[model samples]
Target chain A: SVKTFKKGEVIYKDGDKITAVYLIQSGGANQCLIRGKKTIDLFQLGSSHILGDQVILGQATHPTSAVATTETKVLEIPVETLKQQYEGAPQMLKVIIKSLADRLRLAMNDVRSSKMEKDSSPCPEDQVAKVYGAVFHTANHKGDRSQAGRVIVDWNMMKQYCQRVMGDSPKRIEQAINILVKLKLALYEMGKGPEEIQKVHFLDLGLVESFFEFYQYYYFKSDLLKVDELCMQMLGAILKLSENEQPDRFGIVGVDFAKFSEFCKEINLNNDHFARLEGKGVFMKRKNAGSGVVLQFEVKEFRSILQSWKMLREIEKWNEKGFVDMDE
Target chain B: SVKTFKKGEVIYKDGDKITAVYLIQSGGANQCLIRGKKTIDLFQLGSSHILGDQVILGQATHPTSAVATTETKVLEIPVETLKQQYEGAPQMLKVIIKSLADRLRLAMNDVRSSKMEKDSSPCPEDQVAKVYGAVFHTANHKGDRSQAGRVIVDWNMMKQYCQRVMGDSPKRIEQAINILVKLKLALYEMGKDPTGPEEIQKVHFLDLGLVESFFEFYQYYYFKGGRSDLLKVDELCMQMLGAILKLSENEQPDRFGIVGVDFAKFSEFCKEEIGINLNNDHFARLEGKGVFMKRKNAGSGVVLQFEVKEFRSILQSWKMLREIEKWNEKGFVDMDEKE
Candidate 1:
């Protein structure tokens, strides 16, 4: 049987029984999670995707709710059909083997790419920041100029903000904003008619400032942007330094040679990478020595780096050109 | 006041970071998720089991969901109150620690043993029989004596993988290996010595490529879900999306929305060639929903094809199975292999 779901309609919940495999006819469904009150999309499904393919392994109930992204259509295939076709599957099964030969090395690539992908799928806080940032960048031009965050922005304001920040009409962001609404991060009041037209407002003014602060810190120091594992090790070291009760004024984090080496082993990073990063003259400085290893990251430098990466991301997303290089 | 739930009332969802941890005063609260549309309990919470202790690590949510199997009474502790009680108290805190540690100990045992791999007393070649079957399938699938397929599989390390994946045990697996070595299908890691004696460790695969083929081959072969088998399903789904990504590195990978296959074709192969009847109650758990589908042809008996990306996912899933089979510091090492 084919079925249609409205945007934001949940197809199956985490514990819903898995009966009759769901095949998508149209629209989008996402495997998502709600954490600390934010709906995080782990991944998205497009046309011809399976809803609960785990059912083939004889699973029961849906592990996650298949919420509709737009008006969506689906096919529900009963297990009886699956059983009937079980016998001759191997023969008719197309031999579409991709040699995973060097891909154990590729597994390492998976590890890196997974990290990069995490940024695309943000946390609830990240979602909140996204909308807030979208507002600050674009829609904030008209209202809520007050740093105190007293200004009340509406749904149309946000809709336009996203247009400026994102591109055309933002369907997914609008759908995801419902989460912020539920979390009370954003106050949403619906009028008569469609939910899309509902008036939207953000609850906290300080939250936007804090988000920018966090975004700058992460984006600037962003060891996570680099593909090298050494960058990851340095990032971990910086986090560890913050826990040391007293981090330096200029983002200087320290580690003893012993602990530094230990961190290397942890991320599977090696000696050669540190040398390369040093030569490249980015992210850190060999600032401290006697007591331990001190990596000095200048505050201004970090902020500029964040802006640089932000511009790059915007450029990549918008597919625009003539962006400035780091040296420039 | 304690709330009572009907046998099937749901306490929470997989993605929800439960604000309150429900403590069962009476009846069974099962931590589970639906697979194949069946209620497969990961572990049932009984009296005094604190739900969402991981919330202490302060996760907003876990991947698994929970439900009540019978009339249940639960004392819900709000993390707010729980956090309040956590920071404020003392002598009672000591008492709480003991109880929490006791629970932690029990859970740790389950994690190390039953969750990872159940410790088998000894095997009667039930698992080795499976191992031989794997080799046989690989060998026959290759239909070649070419050296390209030679894989030096460490039996002891291989034991860990088989134990986790297939629930095979020590004695039985050893015996089955002996049987295979006898049949001249595989050699020991040091090259089989008919003159000296028999051993399992340091054994090489008759065909390692055949081993990868085991991924495609095992679906039709059916086995009833044991308590341990139930756990394997749990294990498989643990990294389902993370580990099992369809790389889309195939010819015509996008033609079927990635890894498309005919539902009619697959279901029949699973039944006829694989000897499974989806009509069974055990099989009904598989009913409901596809993972990546956004559209479908719908209806019964329609020639529904599987997506190619998902096909890659299945392969990747099997890859992790082999990847987890990567030899750790478990099992015995013979003289030749050790050197």
Candidate 2:
């Protein structure tokens, strides 16, 4: 039923019987608590916001009251209608219950974070990686791995994975997906809606696998990182150089310092950069004057460090909220 | 299946697949979040707590990790078994979901209260009344009020009422029950246990009725009651009400709960009752405090008319309020230790 309340009209009062939930179609109202002469305003409900849901779930009365701040139009839904719809649906109950749990988890996080020191908070880029890692890890466990070395994930499945595993919001899930697409790490086909069947194809499994592997190490085992762009670029060039030169039987790649120096000035790599890569356990140097200082390291470790370092660099380029323009 | 985990045994890890719900049968575990190397302890779970319930409802993974703090025994029921039982029992689903909502409401309250100031907090007595009023109001809506003028509430029903309406803990619910019973407002007979068939019979529900009445009035009593300082004047109001009731001991009240006493008799009663010599000035003070209304008698002295039930509730409210004051200022309130 449609109803309109003039300004200052009491749409519902605290302690009143909850007859129906009002959906504000236009204008706004103030949700408040009436204690004797004083009214404590909780928040404002604009159009499209719900009213009386707390009691519609199971509560017997309106815990607080709502009054029209301006002339407002609303759609009044009888409780019986909602109850009947709820009774007829089975899966809807699970979705609503999960939503409640998600809200609880969000509140618990806020309370916990308020007590934590500012420095202890996770960095923005790290949070984005964690969210991505959550989706990747879940898809690995449950998604289709029919093709060798690549994983296929449904968009809905990924959203559920991120939400349930980390309480990451849908907005953040989209943000993480956008970050992956922007970096060309993954390709996706858009669905009409999130609930529709949509697929995301990961381009390189090792790119994600190696980044997460280093993420675990960086997150738990270490305090800080000393490697820079030059170190990362130099290591990537070394990997390429070793690939062309053929890695030894042990998978250790050897890059000749004389050959490496050819592009060193362009990539800004110097002797200090070599020390940094070695200091961070990226590679080890073997003194072989004939080959002009052979730099040798396991191909696997070098690839993991370079891939993870590049992903972190790309991740930090986005602002604090980690938002991305999907249109771009 | 019953399983035992030794101290430091990993019960589950964050991001692990939701598998089974663990009902701790003995000992305890630390519910924690594993952030790389550091283990952030959320809280401790003792016996009877159900773990992994968050994901069992619908989540895809365990949001946090839990490990045994001591040698713990648990009854682990697989997700399939739990799902089968839930599918068969329809109403149980609503109950469980409502419990989730109750937990959410409880967390919201903790967050909101943490932001409030100390004096702005509701007094302890007001909390008891609010909890009671929650039950009273809920019962008025859903309970069996077949009998006129009173209400009968199932123990489970009242428990759900307090939990859902106010996010009140079961412990606080029982405390409110104890306070109500101590004040002789309600009568109850214990069931075999809480889940079994049990009932509480409220005696003089008007006592409850009046307490809630004053609760609304006193919720912002300091703000709206008057410019006259209440804490100081309410103490005198209670004393006067006590004396008036004593003076009208033998008199029966009308249907309106109205009883009258000659002013001379009340003056004599106060002199004998609390050794306070009563005079016209004291009546003026009590009048200013709004203790009771008075009228000129047909013959000689002024007649003090008091609502008997209202006076009783006022006396109990003051007694309970002062009791909390003692508990607040000192460490305890004087009480007869009883089971």
Q: Which candidate's DockQ is highest?
A: 2
Model 2's chain A TM-score stands at 0.54
Task: Write model 2 residue lDDT over B137-197, tens digit each, in one string.
Answer: 5455455666666666777656654453233555555555555556566556554645556
Q: Give me the overall lDDT of model 2.
A: 0.61
Q: How close is candidate 1 to the true structure, as a TM-score?
A: 0.25
Question: Which residue segments of model 1 deviate by more than 4 Å?
Answer: A1-328, B13-15, B23-54, B62-66, B75-77, B90-99, B102-108, B111-339
Query: Scoring each candidate complex against the real one, what DockQ results?
Result: 0.01, 0.07
Instruction: Sort candidate 1 into its docking category.
Output: incorrect
Can you write out model 1's per-residue Cα lDDT over A1-328, one digit (the tens) per residue? 7888887787876677877766666787865553333454434566655565444334575655566867888887776665444322331110100111121123323333443444443332223334434444333334554545545566676664344322222544564444344434566567661234556566653444454445544542244333344443464454555365444575544445566666666555454776666543355556657877655555544444443334324323222221111212
lDDT of each: 0.46, 0.61
Find the 10 residues in a row with the least total lDDT in model 1 chain A.
A92-101
Which whole-number lDDT from 0 to 100 does residue A303 have in model 2? 71
